[PDB]
Design a protein around this ligand. Structure first.
Ligand SMILES: *[C@@H]1O[C@H](CO[C@@H]2O[C@@H](C)[C@@H](O)[C@@H](O)[C@@H]2O)[C@@H](O[C@@H]2O[C@H](CO)[C@@H](O[C@@H]3O[C@H](CO[C@H]4O[C@H](CO)[C@@H](O)[C@H](O)[C@@H]4O)[C@@H](O)[C@H](O[C@H]4O[C@H](CO)[C@@H](O)[C@H](O)[C@@H]4O)[C@@H]3O)[C@H](O)[C@H]2NC(C)=O)[C@H](O)[C@H]1NC(C)=O
Ligand SMILES: *[C@@H]1O[C@H](CO[C@@H]2O[C@@H](C)[C@@H](O)[C@@H](O)[C@@H]2O)[C@@H](O[C@@H]2O[C@H](CO)[C@@H](O[C@@H]3O[C@H](CO)[C@@H](O)[C@H](O[C@H]4O[C@H](CO)[C@@H](O)[C@H](O)[C@@H]4O)[C@@H]3O)[C@H](O)[C@H]2NC(C)=O)[C@H](O)[C@H]1NC(C)=O
Ligand SMILES: CCCCCCCC/C=C\CCCCCCCC(=O)OC[C@H](COP(=O)(O)OCC[N+](C)(C)C)OC(=O)CCCCCCC/C=C\CCCCCCCC
Ligand SMILES: CCCCCCCC/C=C\CCCCCCCC(=O)OC[C@H](COP(=O)(O)OCC[N+](C)(C)C)OC(=O)CCCCCCC/C=C\CCCCCCCC
Ligand SMILES: CCCCCCCC/C=C\CCCCCCCC(=O)OC[C@H](COP(=O)(O)OCC[N+](C)(C)C)OC(=O)CCCCCCC/C=C\CCCCCCCC
Ligand SMILES: CCCCCCCC/C=C\CCCCCCCC(=O)OC[C@H](COP(=O)(O)OCC[N+](C)(C)C)OC(=O)CCCCCCC/C=C\CCCCCCCC
Ligand SMILES: CCCCCCCC/C=C\CCCCCCCC(=O)OC[C@H](COP(=O)(O)OCC[N+](C)(C)C)OC(=O)CCCCCCC/C=C\CCCCCCCC
Ligand SMILES: CCCCCCCC/C=C\CCCCCCCC(=O)OC[C@H](COP(=O)(O)OCC[N+](C)(C)C)OC(=O)CCCCCCC/C=C\CCCCCCCC
Ligand SMILES: CCCCCCCC/C=C\CCCCCCCC(=O)OC[C@H](COP(=O)(O)OCC[N+](C)(C)C)OC(=O)CCCCCCC/C=C\CCCCCCCC
Ligand SMILES: *[C@@H]1O[C@H](CO)[C@@H](O[C@@H]2O[C@H](CO)[C@@H](O)[C@H](O)[C@H]2NC(C)=O)[C@H](O)[C@H]1NC(C)=O
Ligand SMILES: CC(C)CCC[C@@H](C)[C@H]1CC[C@H]2[C@@H]3CC=C4C[C@@H](O)CC[C@]4(C)[C@H]3CC[C@]12C
Ligand SMILES: CC(C)CCC[C@@H](C)[C@H]1CC[C@H]2[C@@H]3CC=C4C[C@@H](O)CC[C@]4(C)[C@H]3CC[C@]12C
Ligand SMILES: C[C@]12CC/C(=N\OCCN)C[C@@H]1C(=O)C[C@@H]1[C@@H]2CC[C@]2(C)C(=O)CC[C@@H]12
Ligand SMILES: [Mg+2]
Ligand code: NA
Lengths: 294, 993, 40
């Protein structure tokens, strides 16, 4: 058994068959699998021919935009000691990675960057989503706009003396026009003052009623000094039609933060085409657990 | 419980005297034992009652069903799942509970299967308990000189016991005085006729001597006395029953096939796991992860629903058998009949009816045949001559037996008749084609009768003549044809009378040898009209002197009789032989009768010859002829006792029609073992206790239900509640049909294994988002798939199954490599490709092109990256991309169902085409419809994306698997074509299951 | 179109589920019909 079914010397068989059999089976499987691969490839090519290069056919799973930030928190918590420097390195490294893309050296010349209104403005349509006109042009976004959180003055961005920053960002969506709430009698409390129509407001607060007192002064930095996103940086034409495109950013400094205590801060954007979800905690709003333990 | 001392042939102390017997056990031949001494022995050794069987609590058999071979594989799978969960819990945070759900599901599957199988075996046990009818019995013992009737459980060794025709022999007795006492030794020794028990000794074999009564035997006619020699379990049938209980069970063929199947499944499972383990370690992954990968691949390669499907498959064929009155106690004993290739049968009670019946009759120099079949379905014997009428009057008058009171309901053949067997058969034949014998008897008053002398060997009697025109007297005598022939001088030919010249005397001699050679017992009936002038109506013929002329009588004709076989016995034997099943007769009856029954049922085909037949046809000694020229052989038990192992092997290896006669139960067991030693499956069909050791050791036992014994009924595996023999043919047919169906269903449940493992393999090697989730694999293996696999059992035959030769056990298996090459190699591959196609389509329509999917799993899984760029530049949060992955799982599962359509259609037939067989199986159609409705329900019902995580699909996706399905159908169709046109070619020895 | 191109991000999943359920129900019925067609 053990030895025979492995190699017999009368019928000159190996594993069961002779030399010519293994060849017949190997050749059959090679031809069969080859046909299988060619058919799968053809059915995938017709697919590639069914889609467009300038626009996703279905855009319903990304209708309400998200709200992400610059620091990379494992459990949406920012905990670091003001003494030990090797505690907030993971934060600064990320922050830096994000801001390192807004360097002025990158934004230079007429192509493909264009100087836009230093004050919030309205939408700008660079035509349709075609290749007729060459690569469209995107507005320039300077670093310095963010005043105390830019890594140009205090590289650390704040984490050095108990005053961290948080760069918020709106998820890039093709052909998405941000629309803000109007001045009618129904509007949240916060939003009344500084109603620049052209600015999408972002406002942070405390999750619980108690934590209010323990959170100090939320100082926002942005385009024009407002706490929002200028409508002029939209819409986004997609990578293919707008490479070298920069999305607005908003810095948030959590000055006067109580020491040695976990604070739950929820930031939220307001607008018409903006809707939140009880399941996705990053759709329109975001949560952060800051704890500057020193 | 020494088995060797129980395997030996019975010994005894028969060859002794009445003084030696009374001196060995202690007992007064005329006064018996004393009550004090009787109780001293009763308490000294135990009551005269057989021990009860070894009971069995219900939780024990429930635990038995919870284990086994298949259930054990599922048990190890559940254990592995929980181990991997414990690991993931101690190594990482946010452990997915996928493994725990899969483990509890596997455990539930095993528990449910056990409950169902146990319930079925319990059903059969209850209907089986409704047959043991045990009415207490009391014997007649003589103590201190007085007769008393005490319970059978109070008889001891040494007391005197008296029996009377109609009672049962309590224990093993030693006859001391008898008065024409006959006994029925059919159950123990298998002797069809009543052997007379005489106080004298006659044969060295205790079963052949007449001075010993046996346990469970009944005294037909007469009375006798005897000393209890053996009592309790120490009796003959006690040792036989104890031996039967002390025999092993074995391991059916279906179980061995399932075992080798699990062997292959585990071979390929551990192979894919250890290989992808070394590969994962070669690509960088850590050990902790590689271990989980190994366990995941091994657990993934295990058919969970195949257990319930196989159990239902086997259960379906059992209900049909129960519809035709064929009940199986176990569940796998339904397939053993189809795999049988050598059936060892019993004669008395199984091959025959164990009831004496009038077979042939002689009258008007012509042999006439009578119907000897249970339901009376045959040919009449021309009841138009006067000779027959005179014969009916002779037999109906010169006969003292009468039907037992209150039988007005049963049929003419199954009613109880008080009297001898010959007179009973005669009474039944006359009551059958001559109307009510009670009126035929009251129509002619019997005046004087001279009983049966052992010298006269003839029974005569005179009665009045019912002729209203003739007041004469009628005389009728019956007896052995030679004695009666020497007392006649006339012959009633066609009514008239004629002399007894040597011409008819020689025709009578040839008729006597014709009926005698047929293994029948022939008798002669004659009568004479007494002259009313020499014996007036007033003269009384007292039975003292010669008042009747012994000679010068008128012989009317001979009347033979013998026990006929059951109705469907010849047809069933022929059907079994047609299917290539070797029929070997094994019985403890006389060889002269066994050979005749063998030739009459088909065991010894007409034309074949034995060595003695050749020596008789040539007129030369038997030691000169060569035994190779004889196809059929009759092996005597006495000669079987002195035969080596090789000799028996040669007996079965050179003789095709074998008949073992005068074989003891132990020898029956030896014969069954001699058949197994070679390598063929054996099925023993019997009824008495002598068949218990044969039915137990055989691969499958078939016990009779009405004519069977309780011991052989409890030790058998299949019961024939209707005592029909054609059921054996039905069983051998069903056993095959369900085998080819098991093969088809197995290939069906195994084809889906590939499109359920490939996604994870490409997930680890190519780093793409997980294609097939776990709750979808569960919805496939334990949901939709169940109904179609169950339906595959209802498939009819393709070719004649009762024509092909029996399957070879050493070469043709149940699951070979030809199946694995199809399910795992060709169909499953196409199904996996179709699933991946629908997958890539769903991800390409939402924004993730195939070029950007390779290398994303690290960020596609990360729970803290809320900005994942797609092929177009859009930013997707974590939950949004997860929703798309789940929708891809839903579409993958639906693609599986779509390809399963064509797989169930190509699995319906193994060789034939679909346009030939036809879609006449309504269950399969219902399976397809339900399989589709379930998938649509699981996707479109609200709250499913929350409970099971399955999102709705867009009507354009459902059509991504259709081309693959049609291609599967076309490939298998052309496959099943070259096999037909080219028999024995490459496609056959490579893809023909 | 233009600014108010809100339809470009909406899908009537409700109507789709309703139709898919009607169809599933019909298929289930037909199945039952075929199964019992013969035992009456
Ligand atoms: C985008 O801008 C980044 C900053 O640009 C600087 O400021 C702007 C406004 C302009 O003035 C520009 O000209 C400036 O360079 C730019 O990142 C910068 O890249 C340089 C070159 O590698 C870095 O200089 C090196 O510094 C290290 C030590 O760095 C310490 O501080 C940083 C934080 O700032 C920490 O992350 C580190 O861990 C350290 O704690 C020096 O050791 C190193 O020495 C090298 O140079 C000296 C001569 O000076 C040689 O003798 C040595 O052998 C070495 O070769 C450099 O001096 C600078 O740190 C870095 N800035 C930051 C904040 O990281 C970034 O690359 C730009 N990206 C793009 C895409 O344009
Ligand atoms: C968005 O909306 C706010 C509020 O608009 C007001 O409420 C809306 C719900 C709706 O009903 C509007 O019709 C309504 O105006 C705009 O800001 C408001 O602007 C007015 C005008 O300056 C302010 O009213 C002022 O109230 C002062 C005390 O609180 C009073 O002293 C001021 O005196 C001025 O006007 C009087 C005549 O009434 C004149 O004599 C004086 O010399 C002086 O000019 C004046 O009455 C409101 O307080 C403002 N509301 C808030 C919350 O600050 C806002 O400008 C608008 N934004 C845009 C871009 O349109
Ligand atoms: C990400 C990528 C995805 C990967 C997915 C992988 C999916 C896995 C798919 C299939 C698993 C394949 C595993 C092997 C299966 C072999 C089947 C097998 O073992 O069945 C058992 C049979 C027994 O059969 P029986 O009972 O009828 O025997 C009766 C003998 N009597 C009667 C004479 C005694 O035993 C035999 O067949 C004998 C054993 C023969 C073993 C052959 C081994 C070949 C394996 C690999 C070859 C690769 C070479 C590639 C290079 C080619 C050159 C170019
Ligand atoms: C692009 C898409 C790709 C899809 C690929 C997957 C396809 C798989 C699904 C369906 C395949 C259908 C194949 C059609 C085969 C028809 C064969 C046929 O017609 O052979 C004729 C037979 C032979 O008769 P005979 O001569 O032996 O009769 C003798 C009568 N005597 C004895 C009285 C004389 O006649 C008979 O079988 C009797 C009449 C039976 C009539 C059957 C009709 C039902 C057929 C299919 C059911 C639909 C399933 C749909 C599943 C989707 C669920 C949503
Ligand atoms: C011959 C014999 C024929 C017999 C045929 C029988 C067929 C039976 C046909 C239908 C009965 C199916 C069960 C009905 C279930 C109703 C569930 C329901 O009406 O849910 C409504 C609400 C959804 O509310 P919402 O939209 O505000 O939620 C928003 C949630 N947000 C916003 C957080 C995402 O539910 C919730 O909230 C919680 C959802 C609870 C999940 C229940 C689902 C059960 C899960 C598995 C069982 C299925 C096994 C398959 C059995 C097959 C049998 C053939
Ligand atoms: C004859 C034809 C039969 C056809 C039937 C198809 C057979 C199905 C076969 C296998 C499927 C059973 C698999 C059981 C899956 C259980 C899943 C489970 O337990 O998930 C746990 C989830 C937790 O999820 P999360 O962590 O995301 O929550 C995060 C919540 N945050 C974030 C808001 C805090 O909790 C929840 O979903 C809560 C809702 C609980 C839903 C339980 C549904 C149980 C479904 C089936 C069991 C009964 C089947 C018996 C029929 C057998 C047929 C032979
Ligand atoms: C998306 C999924 C797509 C899947 C598409 C699959 C298409 C691929 C189908 C077939 C390609 C395999 C062809 C292999 C040919 C080389 C095999 C070979 O070397 O064979 C040698 C033998 C001749 O040796 P011998 O027997 O004389 O020696 C006797 C030796 N002893 C004793 C061992 C028997 O060859 C023979 O026997 C002749 C046997 C030739 C095999 C015929 C099999 C045809 C099966 C399917 C074709 C139908 C495709 C329909 C698709 C429609 C799409 C819409
Ligand atoms: C022998 C075996 C017989 C088996 C018979 C099984 C019975 C089949 C039962 C039902 C099938 C009919 C289904 C009809 C449903 C139409 C409903 C409908 O209104 O659906 C519209 C969708 C278009 O969706 P959308 O995404 O564009 O808009 C979405 C717009 N929102 C989402 C904003 C609203 O369209 C769709 O679902 C398209 C629906 C699929 C079209 C049916 C294709 C039939 C394929 C082959 C049959 C050919 C037979 C040839 C006859 C030969 C005779 C000898
Ligand atoms: C012998 C003869 C037998 C004949 C038997 C016939 C049986 C009857 C046959 C058909 C009945 C059809 C019933 C149609 C029900 C429509 C319900 C429906 O359209 O609900 C849709 C909405 C949920 O939409 P959504 O906005 O959350 O979507 C998610 C949007 N996102 C995720 C983007 C945010 O519902 C809601 O809100 C409220 C839902 C309330 C719960 C309704 C329960 C329906 C569940 C099962 C019934 C279906 C059984 C059909 C038979 C199949 C047999 C296998
Ligand atoms: C920042 O928070 C501190 C408290 O942590 C505020 O200063 C306190 O003011 C109260 C009077 O209301 C004094 O009794 C405390 O002694 C002060 N503590 C300190 C550390 O100064 C301070 O006003 C807050 N400043 C801002 C801008 O929010
Ligand atoms: C029925 C079977 C055997 C036919 C198999 C046909 C195979 C060989 C055909 C079907 C579709 C074909 C592909 C169609 C489109 C392209 C894109 C082009 O830029 C390179 C060639 C490539 C990739 C083709 C290669 C060959 C191909 C895969
Ligand atoms: C025997 C063969 C040829 C029959 C093939 C039947 C196919 C075409 C049937 C079977 C089930 C059907 C699907 C059942 C349910 C739905 C959901 C609905 O909202 C759109 C149509 C859609 C997606 C159907 C399309 C057609 C479909 C896929
Ligand atoms: C391998 C598997 C469990 C077994 C399985 N099917 O088991 C059915 C047996 N026929 C396939 C499942 C998957 O593909 C997904 C597997 C899951 C185990 C746990 C896994 C490996 C994870 O942590 C992520 C993927 C999960
Ligand atoms: Mg018998
Ligand atoms: Na058995």
């Amino acid at each position: 058994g053990w030895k025979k079914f492995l190699w017999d010397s009368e019928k000159k068989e190996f594993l069961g068959r002779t030399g010519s059999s293994w060849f017949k089976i190997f050749l059959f499987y090679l031809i069969f699998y080859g046909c299988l691969a060619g058919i799968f490839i053809g059915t995938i090519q017709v697919l590639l021919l069914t889609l467009s290069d300038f626009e996703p056919k279905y855009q319903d799973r990304v209708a309400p935009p998200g709200l992400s930030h610059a620091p990379y928190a494992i459990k949406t918590e920012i905990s670091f000691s003001i003494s030990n420097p090797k505690s907030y390195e993971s934060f600064v490294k990320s922050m830096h990675k994000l801001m390192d893309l807004y360097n002025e050296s990158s934004q230079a010349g007429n192509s493909p960057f264009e100087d836009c209104s230093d004050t919030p403005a309205d939408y700008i349509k660079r035509g349709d989503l075609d290749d007729s006109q060459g690569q469209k042009k995107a507005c320039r976004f300077s670093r310095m706009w963010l005043k105390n959180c830019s890594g140009l003055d205090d590289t650390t961005y704040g984490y050095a003396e108990g005053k961290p920053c948080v760069v918020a960002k709106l998820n890039r969506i093709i052909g998405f026009y941000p629309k803000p709430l109007k001045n009618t009698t129904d509007l949240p409390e916060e939003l009344q003052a500084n109603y620049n129509q052209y600015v999408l407001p972002l406002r942070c607060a405390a999750k619980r009623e108690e934590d209010r007192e323990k959170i100090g002064s939320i100082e926002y930095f942005g385009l024009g000094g407002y706490a929002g996103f200028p409508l002029q940086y939209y819409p986004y034409y997609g990578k293919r039609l707008q490479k070298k495109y920069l999305q607005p950013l908003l810095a948030i400094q959590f000055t006067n933060l109580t020491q040695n205590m976990e604070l739950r801060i929820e930031c939220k954007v307001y607008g018409e085409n903006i809707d939140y979800s009880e399941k996705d905690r990053f759709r329109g709003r975001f949560e952060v657990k800051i704890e500057v333990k020193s | 419980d020494l088995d060797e001392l129980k395997k030996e042939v019975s010994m005894d102390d028969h060859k002794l005297s009445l003084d030696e017997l009374h001196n060995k056990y202690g007992t007064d031949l005329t006064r018996g034992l004393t009550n004090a001494r009787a109780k001293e022995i009763l308490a000294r050794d135990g009551p005269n009652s057989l021990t009860p069987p070894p009971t069995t609590p219900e939780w024990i058999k429930f635990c038995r069903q919870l284990f086994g071979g298949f259930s054990i594989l599922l048990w190890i799978g559940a254990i592995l799942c929980f181990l991997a969960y414990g690991i993931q819990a101690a190594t990482e945070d946010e452990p997915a509970n996928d493994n725990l759900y899969l483990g509890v599901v596997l455990s539930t599957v095993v528990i449910v299967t056990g409950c169902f199988s146990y319930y079925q075996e319990a059903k059969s046990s209850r209907i089986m308990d409704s047959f043991k009818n045990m009415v207490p019995q009391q014997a007649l013992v003589i103590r201190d000189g007085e007769k008393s009737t005490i319970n059978a459980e109070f008889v001891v060794a040494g007391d005197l016991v008296e029996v009377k025709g109609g009672d049962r022999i309590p224990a093993d007795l030693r006859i001391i005085s008898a008065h024409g006492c006959k006994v029925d030794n059919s159950s123990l020794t298998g002797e069809s006729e009543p052997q007379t028990r005489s106080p004298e000794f006659s044969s060295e074999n205790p079963l052949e001597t007449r001075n010993i009564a046996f346990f469970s035997t009944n005294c037909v006619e007469g009375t006798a006395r005897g000393v209890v020699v053996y009592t309790g379990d120490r009796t003959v049938m006690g040792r036989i029953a104890t031996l039967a209980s002390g025999l092993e069970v074995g391991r059916t063929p279906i179980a061995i096939e399932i075992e080798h199947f699990i062997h292959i499944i585990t071979g390929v499972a551990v192979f894919l796991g250890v290989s992808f383990f070394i590969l994962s370690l070669i690509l960088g992954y850590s050990w902790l992860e590689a271990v989980i990968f190994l366990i995941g691949i091994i657990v993934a390669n295990v058919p969970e629903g195949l257990l319930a499907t196989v159990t239902v498959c086997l259960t379906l064929t059992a209900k049909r058998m129960a519809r035709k009155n064929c009940l199986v106690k176990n569940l796998e004993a339904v397939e053993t009949l189809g795999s049988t290739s050598t059936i060892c049968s019993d004669k008395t009670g199984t091959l025959t009816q164990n009831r004496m019946t009038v077979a042939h009759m002689w009258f008007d120099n012509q042999i006439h045949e009578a119907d000897t079949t249970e339901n009376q379905s045959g040919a009449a014997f021309d009841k138009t001559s006067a000779t027959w009428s005179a014969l009916s009057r002779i037999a109906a008058l010169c006969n003292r037996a009468v039907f037992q009171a209150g039988q007005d309901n049963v049929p003419i053949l199954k009613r109880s008749v008080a009297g001898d067997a010959s007179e009973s058969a005669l009474l039944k034949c006359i009551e059958l084609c001559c109307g009510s014998v009670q009126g035929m008897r009251d129509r002619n008053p019997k005046i004087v009768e001279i009983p049966f002398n052992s010298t006269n060997k003839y029974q005569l009697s005179i009665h009045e003549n019912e002729k209203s025109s003739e007041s004469r007297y009628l005389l009728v005598m019956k007896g052995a044809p030679e004695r009666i022939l020497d007392r006649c001088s006339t012959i009633l030919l066609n009514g008239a009378e004629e002399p007894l010249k040597e011409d008819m005397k020689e025709a009578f001699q040839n008729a006597y040898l014709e009926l005698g050679g047929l293994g029948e017992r022939v008798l002669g009936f004659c009568h004479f009209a007494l002259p009313e002038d020499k014996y007036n109506e007033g003269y009384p013929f007292d039975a003292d002197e010669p008042n009747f002329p012994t000679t010068d009588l008128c012989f009317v004709g001979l009347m033979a009789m013998i026990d006929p076989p059951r109705a469907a016995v010849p047809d069933a034997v022929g059907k079994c032989r047609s299917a290539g099943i070797k029929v070997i007769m094994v019985t403890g009856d006389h060889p002269i009768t066994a050979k005749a029954i063998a030739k009459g049922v088909g065991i010894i085909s007409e034309g074949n010859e034995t060595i003695e037949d050749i020596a008789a046809r040539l007129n030369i000694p038997i030691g000169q002829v060569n035994p190779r020229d004889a196809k059929a052989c009759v092996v005597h038990g006495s000669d079987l006792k002195d035969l080596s192992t090789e000799v028996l092997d040669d007996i079965l290896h050179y003789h095709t029609e074998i008949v073992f006669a005068r074989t003891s139960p132990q020898q029956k067991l030896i014969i069954v073992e001699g058949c197994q030693r070679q390598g063929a499956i054996v099925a023993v069909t019997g009824d008495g206790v002598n068949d218990s050791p044969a039915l137990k050791k055989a691969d499958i036992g078939v016990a009779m239900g009405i004519s069977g014994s309780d011991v052989s009924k409890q030790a058998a595996d299949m019961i024939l509640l209707d005592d029909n023999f054609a059921s054996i043919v039905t069983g051998v047919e069903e056993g095959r049909l369900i085998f080819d169906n098991l093969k088809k269903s197995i290939a069906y449940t195994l084809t889906s294994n590939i499109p359920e493992i490939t996604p994870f393999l490409v997930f680890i090697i190519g780093n793409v988002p997980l294609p097939l989730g776990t709750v979808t694999i569960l919805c496939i293996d334990l949901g939709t798939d169940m109904v179609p696999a169950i339906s595959l059992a209802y498939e009819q035959a393709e070719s004649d199954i009762m024509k092909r030769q029996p399957r070879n056990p050493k070469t043709d298996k149940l699951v070979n490599e030809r199946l694995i090459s199809m399910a795992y190699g060709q169909i499953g591959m196409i199904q996996a490709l179709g699933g991946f196609f629908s997958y890539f389509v769903i991800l390409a329509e939402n924004g993730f092109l195939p070029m950007d999917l390779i290398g994303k799993r690290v960020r596609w899984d990360d729970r803290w990256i809320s900005d994942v760029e797609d092929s177009f530049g859009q930013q997707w949060t974590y939950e949004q991309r997860k929703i798309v992955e789940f929708t891809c799982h839903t579409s993958f599962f639906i693609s599986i169902v779509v390809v399963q359509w064509a797989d169930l259609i190509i699995c319906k037939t193994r060789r034939n085409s679909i346009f030939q067989q036809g879609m006449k199986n309504k269950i399969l159609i219902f399976g397809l419809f339900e399989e589709t409705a379930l998938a649509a329900f699981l996707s479109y019902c609200p709250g499913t994306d929350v409970a099971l995580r399955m999102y709705p699909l867009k009507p354009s996706w459902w059509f991504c698997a259709f081309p693959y399905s049609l291609i599967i159908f076309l490939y298998d169709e052309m496959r099943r074509f070259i096999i037909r046109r080219s028999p024995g070619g490459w496609v056959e020895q490579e893809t023909y299951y | 179109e233009g600014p108010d191109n809100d339809e470009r991000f909406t899908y009537d999943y409700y109507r789709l589920r309703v139709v898919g359920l009607i169809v599933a129900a019909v298929l289930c019925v037909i199945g039952i019909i075929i199964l019992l067609a013969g035992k009456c």
